[PDB]
């Protein structure tokens, strides 16, 4: 009954940010120590909780969302941010309660010749709602003429590729991100840290 964080953090392939993955965690013992005692993480920011006291708390359930973005975009995975990622790919609510963990994955997700598997949504009519996941690939109409599913002037495929090559500067390197959100409804708590 021990929470499967290894399935999340150590997955061989991560999702593209536009199609971010979500793992529901329930009915298990958390043990966040293995996370916050790791030197491997370039970012570990918590909101509404103390990482210190994580191992002594309970929640109705936990969500672990995971994806890959550019280094320069990690700052956008936080309440109250704007930008292409927060606006069109992955949006945290203002009242977010949880942790954002990010680490440089240049060794896994960069390829000499450039890895282009990971994509982000560049065109969208409006901002995502918090925790909204948009996976449409409909041609984006930027002008007054209908696209009818054909790419051309003013008719753009909405997803665009990151170009991850090992010699990129760090702001252009891929980072793996896991967002833990902690959910407290009005039901029995099924995710507790080891001291509970």
């Amino acid at each position, epitope marked *: 009954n021990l929470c499967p964080f290894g399935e999340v953090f150590n997955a061989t392939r991560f999702a593209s940010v536009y199609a971010w993955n979500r793992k529901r965690i329930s009915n298990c013992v958390a043990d966040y120590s293995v996370l916050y005692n790791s030197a491997s993480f370039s970012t570990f920011k918590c909101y509404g909780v103390s990482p210190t006291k994580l191992n002594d708390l309970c929640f109705t359930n936990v969500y672990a969302d995971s994806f890959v973005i550019r280094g320069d975009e990690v700052r956008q995975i936080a309440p109250g941010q704007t930008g292409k990622i927060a606006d069109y790919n992955y949006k945290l609510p203002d009242d977010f309660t949880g942790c954002v963990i990010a680490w440089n994955s240049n060794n896994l997700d960069s390829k000499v010749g450039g890895n282009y598997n990971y994509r982000y949504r560049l065109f969208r009519k409006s901002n995502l709602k918090p925790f909204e996941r948009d996976i449409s690939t409909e041609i984006y109409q930027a002008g007054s003429k209908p696209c009818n599913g054909v790419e051309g002037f003013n008719c753009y495929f909405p997803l665009q590729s990151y170009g991850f*090559q090992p010699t990129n500067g760090v702001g252009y390197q891929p980072y793996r991100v896991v967002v833990l959100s902690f959910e407290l409804l009005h039901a029995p708590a099924t995710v507790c840290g080891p001291k509970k």
Partner: antibody
Amino acid sequence: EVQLVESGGGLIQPGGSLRLSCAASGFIVSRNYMIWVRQAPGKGLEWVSVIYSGGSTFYADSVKGRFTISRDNSKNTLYLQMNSLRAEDTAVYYCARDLEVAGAIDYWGQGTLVTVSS
Amino acid sequence: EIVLTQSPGTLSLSPGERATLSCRASQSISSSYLAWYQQKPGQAPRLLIYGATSRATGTPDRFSGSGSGTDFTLTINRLEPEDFAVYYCQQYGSSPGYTFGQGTKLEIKR
């Protein structure tokens, strides 16, 4: 036909205000990354401001707090409200459509001259 | 903030010759985020190249872009009198989101 037609430029005293406007045809302003870029006389290009189709806005450090970019969906036009103008804001201001990695700044208006002077 | 330094500042070449214009960024940027523009006097800039190498619509094949990391190049083969202009590189991948080089002025000999 697609086009971007700018207007509103003219002479203003330092400290004054001016509102630039950019009427679009073909392009749907509210569906595009729309930018203002300026060029002082004899000098290079300097990005000023951007508004995203979702509404997010960003500004160059040199105009932050003084300029405000906006748009009117019903008029299909983009605006740049310029407050507390100084001599260093004298320039030709271009509005332009930005496509980022899908095509960079592919379409530019023809520019309107703003002169800040006593 | 990133700085784009173009070189040379001025260039004088004969028709038929080949112009090579450089852009050196103060830090490494991905090639997907670099573009080149041509500005003729009294006109808006015209996009030549984006993503370091992709020709914009209307750009003839004698214009070609290359480079990566901190160094990018615009090459103009078989120069013509109408190529007289100022050429600007631009990056759009790093804060504040857009930065132009200071331009290379190209004069055509005769």
